[PDB]
């Protein structure tokens, strides 16, 4: 009785209205990419064939 | 039963002018017209002699 090829999927903890930390401040580079005025397609992800 | 509608969209660019500003008391109010209703009064008045 062994696990087959596909893998377990993990789900994150619930978002309580309180008890959240400043995870947005852990980044060290905040360059912004221009999408609306330049890219016609925008950043729409389409999977590979 | 009512299903969806298509909609054409109004042109409201020419309506907005700086000389015609909003004043107190000219907001849009929706009041239904009164409808008269007939009421029956078959209830006999109390007669305890």
């Amino acid at each position: 009785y062994q696990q087959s090829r596909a893998l377990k999927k993990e789900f994150s903890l619930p978002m309580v209205p309180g008890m959240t930390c400043g995870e947005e401040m852990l980044r060290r580079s905040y360059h912004r990419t221009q999408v609306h005025g330049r890219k016609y397609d925008t950043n729409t992800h389409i999977d590979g064939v | 039963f009512k299903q969806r509608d298509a909609v054409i969209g109004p042109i409201v660019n020419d309506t907005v002018d700086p000389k015609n500003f909003l004043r107190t008391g000219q907001g849009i109010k929706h009041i239904v017209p009164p409808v008269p209703h007939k009421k029956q009064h078959r209830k006999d008045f109390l007669d305890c002699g």
Binding site: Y1, Q2, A6, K8 | -
Partner: protein, 269 residues
């Protein structure tokens, strides 16, 4: 791989409705718009490695003899000569269903199981109690090592009843499930004791109608007795129903007798 009766598994759950790997069986197949029929000869259908492992496995004879004497002990002592109730109580300690979708047997559960047969006992002296402990431990060890194990060292209940009860066709399982579906008015996995009381058919039974050897209401009360949780909350899960009908199907041989008694047993709509 998508023929009728093909069992396959793909992988771990990808949504929150399941908690473990599950097997799927194809019940319908349509090919009105299929133009490329591909197939590999001399190959297994679907992804059913557990079934292949069960088919290729072989169990020892002394294990079969031990289970035979254990079944006899339940049928007499735990029942009253009625084989259905005896087999029903035989899987009492393995009712819990895991995230895989199948019931597992632990070694301690097996030891508790064999001890409940009321056969390995004697006078309450110290030496006799020690001898009974040694005997039940040897029997439990013999049974435990004759079956394949998974991670955490457990064996399968269905493969166990394949040698306790015997093979069972798909039609019998379908009919049992159809009765359970008809009797369950919610969509949970529990039956109410009042529904069982209302839908059972003690009245037309010939031992109460033409022979007058038993009373109808007394036999109805005796039937309500055998359920394990009738005096406390009155909920009968799916596993207990399937255990009772495992015993019933083990008792009878012929298909038409099984189907006739199955239809006559319950007066459903």
């Amino acid at each position: 791989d998508f023929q009728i009766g093909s069992i396959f598994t793909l992988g771990g759950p990808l949504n929150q409705r399941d908690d473990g790997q599950k097997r799927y069986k194809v019940v319908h197949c349509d090919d009105s718009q299929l133009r490329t029929r591909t197939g590999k000869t001399l190959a297994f259908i679907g992804n059913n490695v557990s079934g292949l492992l069960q088919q290729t496995h072989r169990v020892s004879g002394e294990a079969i003899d031990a289970l035979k004497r254990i079944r006899e002990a339940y049928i007499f002592n735990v029942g009253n000569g009625i084989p259905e109730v005896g087999i029903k109580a035989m899987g009492r300690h393995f009712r819990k269903v895991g995230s895989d979708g199948r019931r597992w047997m632990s070694y301690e559960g097996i030891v508790r199981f064999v001890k409940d047969s009321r056969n390995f006992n004697a006078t309450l002296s110290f030496s006799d109690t020690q001898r009974t402990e040694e005997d039940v431990n040897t029997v439990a060890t013999c049974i435990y090592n004759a079956f394949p194990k998974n991670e955490e060292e457990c064996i399968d209940y269905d493969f166990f009843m394949d040698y306790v009860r015997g093979p069972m066709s798909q039609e019998r399982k379908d009919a049992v499930w159809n009765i359970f579906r008809r009797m369950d008015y919610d969509r949970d996995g529990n039956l109410n004791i009042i529904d069982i009381q209302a839908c059972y058919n003690t009245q037309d039974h010939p031992t109460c109608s033409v022979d007058h050897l038993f009373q109808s209401d007394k036999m109805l009360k005796g039937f309500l007795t055998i359920w394990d949780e009738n005096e406390r909350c009155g909920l009968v899960p799916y596993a207990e129903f399937l255990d009772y009908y495992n015993g019933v199907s083990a008792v009878l041989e012929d298909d038409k007798v099984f189907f006739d008694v199955l239809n006559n047993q319950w007066k459903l709509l």
